[PDB]
Amino acid sequence: MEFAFYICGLIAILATLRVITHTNPVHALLYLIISLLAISGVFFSLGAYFAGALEIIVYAGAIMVLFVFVVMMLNLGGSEIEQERQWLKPQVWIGPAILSAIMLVVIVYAILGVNDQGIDGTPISAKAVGITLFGPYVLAVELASMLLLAGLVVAFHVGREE
Amino acid sequence: ISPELIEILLTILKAVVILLVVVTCGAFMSFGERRLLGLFQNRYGPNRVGWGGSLQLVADMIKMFFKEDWIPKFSDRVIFTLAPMIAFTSLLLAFAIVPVSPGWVVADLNIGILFFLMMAGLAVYAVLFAGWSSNNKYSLLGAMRASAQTLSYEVFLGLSLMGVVAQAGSFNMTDIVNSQAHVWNVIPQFFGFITFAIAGVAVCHRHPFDQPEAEQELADGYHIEYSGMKFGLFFVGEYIGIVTISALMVTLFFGGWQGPLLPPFIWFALKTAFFMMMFILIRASLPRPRYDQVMSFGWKICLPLTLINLLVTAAVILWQAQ
Amino acid sequence: MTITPQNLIALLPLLIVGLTVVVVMLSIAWRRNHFLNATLSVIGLNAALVSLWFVGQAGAMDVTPLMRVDGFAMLYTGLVLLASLATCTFAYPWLEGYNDNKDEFYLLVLIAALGGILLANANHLASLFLGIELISLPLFGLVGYAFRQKRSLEASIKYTILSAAASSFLLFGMALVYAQSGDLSFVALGKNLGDGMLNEPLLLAGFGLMIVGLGFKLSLVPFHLWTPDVYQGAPAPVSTFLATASKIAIFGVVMRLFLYAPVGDSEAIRVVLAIIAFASIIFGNLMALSQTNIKRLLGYSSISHLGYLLVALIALQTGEMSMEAVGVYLAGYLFSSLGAFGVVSLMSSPYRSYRGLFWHRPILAAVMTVMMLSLAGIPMTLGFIGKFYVLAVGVQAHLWWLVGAVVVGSAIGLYYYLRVAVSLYLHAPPSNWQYSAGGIVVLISALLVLVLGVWPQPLISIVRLAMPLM
Amino acid sequence: MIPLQHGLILAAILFVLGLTGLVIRRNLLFMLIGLEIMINASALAFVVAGSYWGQTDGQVMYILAISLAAAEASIGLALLLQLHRRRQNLNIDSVSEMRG
Amino acid sequence: STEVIAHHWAFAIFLIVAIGLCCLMLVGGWFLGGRARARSKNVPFESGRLSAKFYLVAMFFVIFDVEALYLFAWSTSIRESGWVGFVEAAIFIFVLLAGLVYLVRIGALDWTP
Amino acid sequence: NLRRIMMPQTWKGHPLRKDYPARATEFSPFELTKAKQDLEMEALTFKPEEWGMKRNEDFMFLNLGPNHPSAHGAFRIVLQLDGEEIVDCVPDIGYHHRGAEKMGERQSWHSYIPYTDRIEYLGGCVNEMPYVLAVEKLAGITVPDRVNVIRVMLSELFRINSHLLYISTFIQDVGAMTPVFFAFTDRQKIYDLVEAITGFRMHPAWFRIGGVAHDLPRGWDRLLREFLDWMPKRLASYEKAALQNTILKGRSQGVAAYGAKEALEWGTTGAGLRATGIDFDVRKARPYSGYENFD
Ligand SMILES: CCCCCCCCCCCCCCCCCC(=O)OC[C@H](COP(=O)(O)OCCN)OC(=O)CCCCCCCCCCCCCCCCC
Ligand SMILES: CCCCCCCCCCCCCCCCCCCC
């Protein structure tokens, strides 16, 4: 339980670090596929079976398939991306990096001063999530379907060839 | 020496035996593809390499091992090497949750068929990566067409599964195969039967949905740049996927290993092999539809059919439970 | 918790707008008719408006672990529904010149109004999150409705990226406050603490991330820079809709969150929000000194008046009439922003110079200048009653710095508002009933502003009637 | 026996890495990637917060988070497709005409 | 228990042996066999911008697959949720089918010109 | 555009002029150096302005061929694609130019018949028939009726062979792969009869000026009877298995349709013209070789 969680977290952080510091869109997309697999391994270590299963079903199975589809649309062969590599110049990235660094310091200082007795890792089955989803969270289900409908119709209206 | 370690080693040995049997019957299903097309086309097929052609598959394995393995210089190396790996391992791991016999299962997961669904997602990743990595606009458009096809059928694959999920009441394979102890699931989930059959055929790159044989004349197949053992990896992955979808179908809709008189593994093998022969019949018989027709049948027909099937299944289940 | 028939009549507006979305969608799918879809849009919004009267007959009820309906909810739901009705009425003559598909606009308006109703009724972290996102999604739908235009497309990209970032900020704070507290109900935030350790660091940090998200959502400093770009790039009915309904709905849910939470009276949160109010008023008044365009000017005005609103917010735990002041000032805000952006919309319609407007459109110039005065806090207008209420609220709780901020910002607002007002009457070198309907809407907005600036007692009584669950 | 704090920190490095991915990148595709990093980080934080208390509320809000992820990813990618179709570039600093 | 950890180790053994078998077969394919050189060997097989309907189909799949995951969560607890959950899933299905009918009737799913 | 249609643009002279050397032995042996291969591959590269494509910045350009994994020769099509719609295309032919007319200026009257055999390699005696008919018109030769019936029989046999191959290849192009095996077995039966009568399978070269090469062997009626009772049940099975399939109908019905005007102005004959309702067949309009003695 501990080994899988820590290994998946380590390769997760390494993977997303390789995503944000890469120039090839397909290579970064593959790296974040690996990262999402790692987040789902973290979820399975924590006992959230439905959450990690769903991360590989749609988060690592549907949305980024559309991402690769758009990369296939554009055929990004490195035009106006790698010819300057301006995001690797230290005068560009050092400032925002120290911004996110002091933000991370503040966030982990807030996290480290809270109670904790550990996570027992008892599995939460998909039937309990289904019971709660169509129990006290029914408005969330229907209005999230409405949200998906709104995203669908706007993406249709904008993404047209004509 | 300890009985717990003995049981662990026996379970590991059973899993390894199952995996080796699956890959060997995938290669033997390549050989059975050739032989059964020969039988169905009023011929014999390969029958001179060994007795009855049984040593032909060794010759293809030797040839594709000792053929030159070549990665194009203009192609990206890592994605080119990676795509057949995914196309093999995704459907292999999709097999990995099938209960063949009582006491003979690799992983009695609480999810199962969900893990099959995410391996199908990995399969669409495999075809997308194989298409993009070749650096060829013919393979680019061909694999885009194939990937859109398999998306348009993987959208309702899970919803066709959901009828059997509703009847079983859980996600585990053992509960699914034990809910068919009285009546086989092919009878109530007949719409689930046809929709899952169509989705499994389309998602596994099989006729009449196989893109590299859909348009050979445009020279736009995404396998066109793949040669050597990568090509054999692609076909072994496709045939292993045929075996995987057949075993999934047997354990889902046809009662799995349950049988009146024969041992359960014999019944499982017979039902799987019957569905493999059904694959041969639909490959050799069914003509290939046009691409927009495939889009229309995937979206405007099959998905509402799965939704209505799930609604009717829920109404019947709650109505019967007073 | 199960849903009773009394609970079904409590969900009357959300159900009505959902059914209207379905009906409008099926009418679009049958035949693409612009006028029929607009007619079903306004008919459904009016049906929801009458459903608020039925809910007011029904009464107040906690309906879900999520949702809660009280007079607060009916009042803000009515404000949002009036805003969306005005948006449709102004959007039809603008859409009369659009060559592309016209019928998706009303569908997006009803979806965002449904999200605004969700946010008005929200009594949960899940309800707040889903209502915010239901507001946000068709807002990028309508801002970039004319993607052929340069300005609309860049404003759409800006709002999309910035709102997605603020959404993740709010949701991360949501996860942190759930990790600290243990329940997502509004009343249990900080209820697990007492005896002086209410200021838990993880609770405060998660709450501050939600404050960052909502401060983006109400155009608060320093998340205020998106306002003029998105306001100018978007079409004028979209500018009206975003200026009124989104701000009203998210400010109502911020009222409810800071009223119900036991940690809402924290000292550090009070100081942080006081700093945000001070900076927002001062900045959003100082930006609009030298603006030649109406839309960016109204965006900075929106930043300044949202600073005034949060000034009224900061004394909700000490004073008692803070909710009444917020309701009155939001009524004045609603009528003012429909007035200004409606005159802008009828000037910019159909799709294809405020100086010297009086010599071609005299009544439009008249409604524009009275509403320009109404935004300033000039007497005989409802905006003056709004500043009077917020200044009384700030006085009774010894918020002297924020009072001086309101005074200075109102002086700067007087400068640029009456600058535009005198620019209207200088000298410079239609024929359909829907344009007349939009003009009628802006004229009743002007008459409501004038009458409620003369006799503000009925509005005060109406807002005092709508009390929340104590 | 896994501490809740460790999962919270892990989600924090993922969130701030998504923050850098939004800020320092001029390709809008990589910016949408970074937005996905933040949203996935928030979903992971909410999952581990739910699993600490042993409740399904974290999983439900995770599902809501990924529904939002799908909607807004489609939204941003439609906007990217239209921008690349009509502008022939993906540099966002070029998309800065409005100013004031 | 012993049985569950035995099944977990069997699954891990399946994972690593499948990975090693595929990688070993690719290694054997790449290692063996002599190599050739030619001029047109490294040129591609051409025998000597495309439309965004692919994106529209994929994004359609994304949205309908998220609604499908909602149905996936519902399907495992149909009996315990009672008739009320069935009714709520019925408005869910009605909204989904109304959206699909809308997409069909506007040519969004109609690929042909 | 008056460009070369059969030969590459990098060609000198005009072959059908009387002073041109017909034989490749008169020319130098075909050297294919590195530079020659480079310029020959450069000549086959298609650039839109010369061929009249006149390229919006969205039209995808597609190349099919010149290699052609099908039975009907090898050729190239250049395609302009508005998304997935073919907006303009021009065929590229001349990849199978055998120089048959200049060859006919080289061989004698008798020796030319094997060259008329391979004009269309699915006709055989059907291709031999008009050449020997025109030669007999030149020589004033009136063939006997038995010669006419033998030539009619061989022409009909090769017509059935060609139609079987066409149906098999079309069905395989749709996607059904078994009728190609069955129809090629039927072609083997036809080839058995043709081998027995003439002595070769695809190209018999059996017609002669004024008659046929040999007399019929004893027993041809047995093989003809065997094929005649073998055929119709196989044709009915062909129809019921693939031609009445609804997927094949959806693939084929309404695809590339034209009326009588478009067929007439573009010179289309055969079933392409007869599908427009224009009843024009040579065997009935202008009867030749005693085709009027058949019902
Ligand atoms: C382990 C699981 C699998 C085991 C193997 C057994 C199952 C194999 C399943 C194979 C699935 C193949 C699906 C092919 C679908 C093609 C749909 C399509 O696009 O059809 C187009 C065609 C014409 O469409 P239209 O729009 O009318 O065209 C007008 C243009 N002139 O429209 C038509 O032709 C209309 C009819 C379309 C197809 C109807 C459904 C056919 C289902 C497949 C055959 C099943 C036979 C029994 C299998 C064994 C059962 C025990
Ligand atoms: C296509 C079929 C693939 C099957 C893969 C797994 C094979 C496992 C074989 C197990 C054999 C023993 C089964 C348990 C005992 C019952 C049967 C006894 C007689 C064989």
Q: Which of F57, F84, F251 to mutate to test the interface with E (most CBs of E within 10 A)?
A: F84
Q: Which of C339, C326, C306, C333 is nearest to C447 (CA)?
A: C339
Structure token pair of residue E7: 């099944």
Contact C384, C417 (CB under 8 A): no
Q: Which residues contact D51 (CB under 8 A, 6 or more apart)?
A: A46, A47, A48, A119, A121, A124, D7, D58
Distance CA F129, CA F136 (A): 11
Q: Which residues contact C199 (CB under 8 A, 6 or more apart)?
A: C266, C267, C268
Instruction: Say which residue the tokens 């509403």 belong to.
Output: C371
What residue spans of B96-136 are helical by DSSP H? 113-133
Quote the distance between the C-alpha of residue C408 and its chain's center: 24
Cβ contacts of A111 on chain C, cutoff 8 Å: 176, 202
Cβ contacts of B108 on chain E, cutoff 8 Å: 7
Structure token pair of residue C286: 């100082």
Cβ contacts of B233 on chain E, cutoff 8 Å: 22, 25-26
Range of the domain at D38: 4-94
Q: With respect to residue D66, please indicate whether it lies within any of the assigned structural domains.
A: yes
How far apart, in Å, are the Cα atoms of B299 and each of A79, B296, F250? 36, 5, 18
DSSP-derived secondary structure for B40-62: HTTS--S-TTTGGGTTHHHHHHH
* Burial state string for C162-173 with b = 16 or more CB within 10 A and e = fewer than 16: bbbbbbbbbbbb
Q: Which residues contact C159 (CB under 8 A, 6 or more apart)?
A: C139, C140, C143, C226, C230
| Residue E56 exposed, middle or buried by CB count within 10 Å (0-12, 13-18, 19+) | buried
CATH H-level, domain E2-105: superfamily: NADH:ubiquinone/plastoquinone oxidoreductase, chain 3 (1.20.58.1610)
Structural biology method used: cryo-EM
Greatest Cα pair distance, chain F, in angstroms, is 70
Contact D70, E66 (CB under 8 A): yes
How far apart, in Å, are the Cα atoms of E92 and each of A114, A149, B156, E96? 40, 11, 16, 6
Q: Which of B89, B291, B85, B306 is nearest to B202 (CA)?
A: B291
Query: Cis omega (within 30 of 0) on the bond before B287?
Result: no
Contact C155, C136 (CB under 8 A): no
**Sign (positive/negative) of CA torsion C323, C325, C328, C333?**
negative
How many domains is chain D partitioned into structurally?
1
**What angle is formed at CA F244 by the lines to CA F242 and CA F249, rounded to 5 degrees?**
95
Taking the CA of residue B184 as centre, how many other CA atoms within 13 Å lie in the half-sphere pointing to its CB?
A: 16
Contact C337, C304 (CB under 8 A): no
Structure token pair of residue C230: 């998105």
Structure token pair of residue C452: 């409620």
Q: Ligand 2 test: best mutation among B25, B29, B31, B101, most atoms within 8 Å of CB?
A: B101
Instruction: Say which residue the tokens 């489609």 belong to.
Output: D74
Q: How far is the CA of B100 from the centre of ligand 2 (A)?
A: 6
- Within 10 angstroms of residue F106's Cβ, the number of other Cβ atoms is 13
Which listed ligand is nearest to B292 at the C-alpha? 1
Contact of chains F and E by CB distance (3 or more pairs under 8 angstroms): yes
Instruction: Say which residue the tokens 């009626």 belong to.
Output: F221
Q: Which residues contact D62 (CB under 8 A, 6 or more apart)?
A: A48, A51, A54, D43, D46, D47, D50
Q: Write down which chains contact chain F via at least 3 CB pairs under 8 A.
A: B, E
Structure token pair of residue E77: 């607890």
| Residue B2 exposed, middle or buried by CB count within 10 Å (0-12, 13-18, 19+) | exposed
**Residue with the nearest Cα to atom 2 of ligand 2?**
B269
| Rg of chain E taking only CA atoms, in angstroms | 26
Q: Which residues contact E38 (CB under 8 A, 6 or more apart)?
A: none
Distance CA A14, CA A37 (A): 13
Q: Which residues contact F52 (CB under 8 A, 6 or more apart)?
A: F1, F90
Q: Which residues contact B250 (CB under 8 A, 6 or more apart)?
A: B256, B268, B271, B272, B275
Atom of ligand 1 lying closest to residue F245 CA: 34
Q: With respect to residue D47, please indicate whether it lies within any of the assigned structural domains.
A: yes
Q: With respect to residue D73, please indicate whether it lies within any of the assigned structural domains.
A: yes
Nearest to D82 among A137, A152, A158 (CB): A158
CATH classification at residue A129: 1.20.120.1200
Quote the distance between the C-alpha of residue F258 and its chain's center: 22
C68, containing H or E segment: strand C67-69
Q: Provide the residue type at C469 as one letter.
A: L
**Sign (positive/negative) of CA torsion C457, C462, C463, C469?**
positive
**Residue with the nearest Cα to atom 8 of ligand 2?**
B18
Quick check: E33 contacting F, CB < 8 Å? no
Cβ contacts of F246 on chain B, cutoff 8 Å: none
How far apart, in Å, are the Cα atoms of C342 and each of A142, B186, C163, C467, F110? 33, 62, 25, 31, 95
Q: Break chain E into its structural domains and give their ranges.
A: 2-105
Residues in chain E: 113
Judged by CB atoms closer than 8 Å, whether chains meet at E73 and A145 is answered as no
- E-only strand ranges, chain B: none
How far apart, in Å, are the Cα atoms of C284 and each of A85, C227, C342? 37, 10, 22
How many domains is chain A partitioned into structurally?
1
Contact C125, C181 (CB under 8 A): no
Q: Ligand 2 test: best mutation among B23, B251, B265, most atoms within 8 Å of CB?
A: B265
CATH classification at residue D27: 1.10.287.3510
F77, containing H or E segment: strand F76-82
Backbone angles phi, psi at F264, to 5 degrees: -70, -45
Structure token pair of residue C47: 């049906």
Range of the domain at C386: 1-470
Judged by CB atoms closer than 8 Å, whether chains meet at F84 and E51 is answered as yes
DSSP-derived secondary structure for C93-107: HHHTT--S--THHHH
Residues in chain F: 295
Cβ contacts of F247 on chain B, cutoff 8 Å: 208, 286-289
How far apart, in Å, are the Cα atoms of C414 and each of C376, C380, C410? 5, 15, 6
Judged by CB atoms closer than 8 Å, whether chains meet at E75 and B310 is answered as yes
